[PDB]
Structure 1
Amino acid sequence: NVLTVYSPYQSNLIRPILNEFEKQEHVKIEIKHGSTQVLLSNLHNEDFSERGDVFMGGVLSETIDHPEDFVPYQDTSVTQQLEDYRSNNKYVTSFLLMPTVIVVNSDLQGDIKIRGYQDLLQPILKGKIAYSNPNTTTTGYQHMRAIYSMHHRVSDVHQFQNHAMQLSKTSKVIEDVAKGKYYAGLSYEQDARTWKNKGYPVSIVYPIEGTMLNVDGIALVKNAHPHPKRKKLVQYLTSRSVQQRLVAEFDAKSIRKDVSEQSDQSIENLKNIPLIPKSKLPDIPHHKFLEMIQ
C-alpha cells in the first residue's frame, strides 16, 4: 500500500502537498531524501522488487544516467505547460522551475562586490565560499555547468573549485552561509528563501554572467509491483491547483502556463532573471561533463 517517493527536495516543500494527496487517495507516502545522484545511484543498485514508485526533484531530464531504471510516461497536461520547459525526455515530466542562485551573507559582505561567478574569484573570498559536490548533487552540477557556460573554459570550473570549499549536502551550503560560516555559497532559489524568510542575513544573487535554470522533473521508477496510484500522483503534482499552491505558499515557479507567478518580494520574476539562453547551454551529457571536469 505504501507509495515510496525519492526526492532531493527539502521536506518543508513537498511534505505538505504529499500529505494532502495521502488524505485524498487513502495511501501512505514515504519519502527517501538525499542528494539527487545519490538517490539515483542507490536506486540503480536497488533490486527491481524493492524499488520505490516515483522520483520527484532534480533536473531529471538531463542527469538520469540509467534511463532503464524508469518507466516511460507522460503527463496529459503537457499541453498546459510552458513551451520552453516541457520535457523532451520520455521518462520525465516537468514539474517546477528552480533558478540556481548565489547566496551572500549581508553581515559579512561589507564592501565586497558579489554580482556573479567572476566576483567570487576575488582573493578576499578565497576559502570563504561554499558549494555542494557536483558529482552527487543537482545544485553543484548545474552550477559547474553555469560556470563552464561563461567562456566554455574548464579552467574557470577548476579556478572556482580551488577557490571554494566543497560540502557534501546542498542544504548545508545555505545553512552555513546564513549562519555566518561562509561569505557566499552556491545554492538554489527555494532553499535560499527558506532561510531568508526566517530572518537570516541572506541576499539572493542571480549570477550576472548567466543564471542556470533548473527544470525539475518527475519520473516513474521501474519496479516489480508499481503502486496503482503513482500515475495519479504525477497528475496531482502537475495539476493547476497544486501548482498554484506551490507558488502561493512556497514562492515556487510553476511549470504551467495557466498559473501566474508570484515574486513581488523578494526577487525575481523569470523574465527579469538573466538566464543562460537555451542556445548557450552546454550540450555535454551529464556523466561525460562530470568526468571532463574531474
Structure 2
Amino acid sequence: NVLTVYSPYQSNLIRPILNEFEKQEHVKIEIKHGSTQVLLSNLHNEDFSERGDVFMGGVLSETIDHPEDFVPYQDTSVTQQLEDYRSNNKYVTSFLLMPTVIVVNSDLQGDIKIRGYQDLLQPILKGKIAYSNPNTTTTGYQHMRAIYSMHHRVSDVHQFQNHAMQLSKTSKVIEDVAKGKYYAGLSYEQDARTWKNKGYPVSIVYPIEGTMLNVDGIALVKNAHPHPKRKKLVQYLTSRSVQQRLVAEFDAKSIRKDVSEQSDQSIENLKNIPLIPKSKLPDIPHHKFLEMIQ
C-alpha cells in the first residue's frame, strides 16, 4: 500500500509535490524525517523487511557510508542533467542543487558587516553564531568542508567552532537566527528562504571566500519488499515538468538542462554565487574528514 521515503528535507519543500504524486499515481507516501546521517544510520540498522523504499535529499553521492543498503540505479534522465553535477555514484541520481548559505538576522545585525566566513570571526559575534552537528547533518558537514577548503587548514575549522555554538538539528539554526537567538548561522538556501518568505528578518549571505554547492541525490533503498512504483517516483522527481514546478514555486535550482533558472529577489543565480571550484575540494572520504577536524 504505502511507499516510504527517507528525507532530510523539511516537509514544506517535498510534501506538496509528493502529494501531487499521490494524486497522479494513487499511491500513499509517508516520509521519515531526520538529519541526513541519522536517517542513514537508522536505515542501516533497520531490518530488510521494515525498510522504506526511497531516500531523497542530502549529498548522497558522497556521504553514503553503507552502499550495501542501496540498489545500484540511476534514472535514465541523467542524460538531460547539467554536465557538471551528474552523480558519479551508481547508487545515486542527482536531484537538486542546494547552495549552503550564511543566514543573518537583519534586525540584530545593525552596522556589523558579514560577507562570509572570515567576518563570522569578528569578536562581537563570539558565541552568538550557530551551526549544526557536522557528524550527523549534511549542512554542518558541508559547511565545515567549505571552511576547510579556504586554505586547507584544520585550524580554520577549529577557529570557527571555538567561535560558534553547535546545534543538533540544521533547521534549529535558521529558526533560532530568524527568531533572534543568534546573530547569524550556517544554513542552506531553501531553509533560509522558508523563513525569509514568512516575513522573518533574515538575510541570505553567500560566503565570498567560497560557497559550497550541494548536489542533492535520490537513491533506492535495498529492502525485502520494494514498492513497485518507487522507480516511477524517482522518474517523477527528476522529470522536467516536476523540476520546473519546484523551480517556479520554491526558487529551487534544477538538476536539468531543460528547466528554467529562477532567483527571485535575494536568492542568487549560480552564476552570481562564488562557488568553491571542484579543484579546491581535496577528495577526502566523509569519515576521514570528520576524523581530521575532530
> When the two structures are superposed, what TM-score results if normalisation uses the length of structure 2?
0.99
| Post-superposition offset of 1:267 | 2.6
Segment of structure 1 superposing worse, 279-288 or 167-176: 279-288
Per-residue CA deviation, residues 79-98 of structure 1 (Å, 9 max, x unaligned), is: 10000000100000000000
| Post-superposition offset of 1:194 | 0.5
Per-residue CA deviation, residues 218-254 of structure 1 (Å, 9 max, x unaligned), is: 0000001111000000000000010000000111000
Per-residue CA deviation, residues 105-128 of structure 1 (Å, 9 max, x unaligned), is: 111111111101010011111000
| Post-superposition offset of 1:290 | 0.8
SS of 1:119's equivalent in the other structure is: helix
SS of 2:14's equivalent in the other structure is: helix
After TM superposition, list the pairs within 5 Å mapping 1:58-77 onto structure 2. Answer: 58-77=58-77
State how far apart, in whole Å, the 2-side matches of 1:183 and 1:128 are: 6
Per-residue CA deviation, residues 122-176 of structure 1 (Å, 9 max, x unaligned), is: 1111000000000000000000000000010001111111100000110000000
State how far apart, in whole Å, the 2-side matches of 1:30 and 1:291 are: 35
| Post-superposition offset of 1:264 | 3.7
State how far apart, in whole Å, the 2-side matches of 1:106 and 1:25 are: 43
State how far apart, in whole Å, the 1-side matches of 2:201 and 2:10 are: 20
- RMSD of aligned alpha carbons: 0.6
SS of 2:31's equivalent in the other structure is: strand
What stretches of structure 2 of length at least 5 have no aligned partner?
Answer: none
State whether residues 102 and 185 of structure 2, in contact with CA within 8 Å, keep that contact through their aligned partners in structure 1. yes
Q: How many residues align?
A: 294
SS of 1:97's equivalent in the other structure is: strand
State whether residues 140 and 186 of structure 2, in contact with CA within 8 Å, keep that contact through their aligned partners in structure 1. yes
State how far apart, in whole Å, the 1-side matches of 2:276 and 2:286 are: 18
Per-residue CA deviation, residues 249-283 of structure 1 (Å, 9 max, x unaligned), is: 11100000000111141230011100001111131
State how far apart, in whole Å, the 1-side matches of 2:235 and 2:102 are: 32
SS of 1:182's equivalent in the other structure is: coil
State whether residues 6 and 31 of structure 1, in contact with CA within 8 Å, keep that contact through their aligned partners in structure 2. yes
State how far apart, in whole Å, the 1-side matches of 2:265 and 2:247 are: 13
State whether residues 58 and 216 of structure 2, in contact with CA within 8 Å, keep that contact through their aligned partners in structure 1. yes
State how far apart, in whole Å, the 1-side matches of 2:67 and 2:115 are: 37
State whether residues 174 and 187 of structure 1, in contact with CA within 8 Å, keep that contact through their aligned partners in structure 2. yes
State whether residues 82 and 255 of structure 2, in contact with CA within 8 Å, keep that contact through their aligned partners in structure 1. yes
Paired residue for 2:277?
A: 277
What stretches of structure 1 of length at least 5 have no aligned partner?
Answer: none
State how far apart, in whole Å, the 1-side matches of 2:136 and 2:78 are: 29
State whether residues 145 and 282 of structure 1, in contact with CA within 8 Å, keep that contact through their aligned partners in structure 2. no
State how far apart, in whole Å, the 2-side matches of 1:207 and 1:75 are: 33
Per-residue CA deviation, residues 173-207 of structure 1 (Å, 9 max, x unaligned), is: 00000110000000000000110011111110000
Per-residue CA deviation, residues 4-34 of structure 1 (Å, 9 max, x unaligned), is: 0000000000000001111211111010000
State whether residues 146 and 210 of structure 2, in contact with CA within 8 Å, keep that contact through their aligned partners in structure 1. yes
> When the two structures are superposed, what TM-score results if normalisation uses the length of structure 1?
0.99
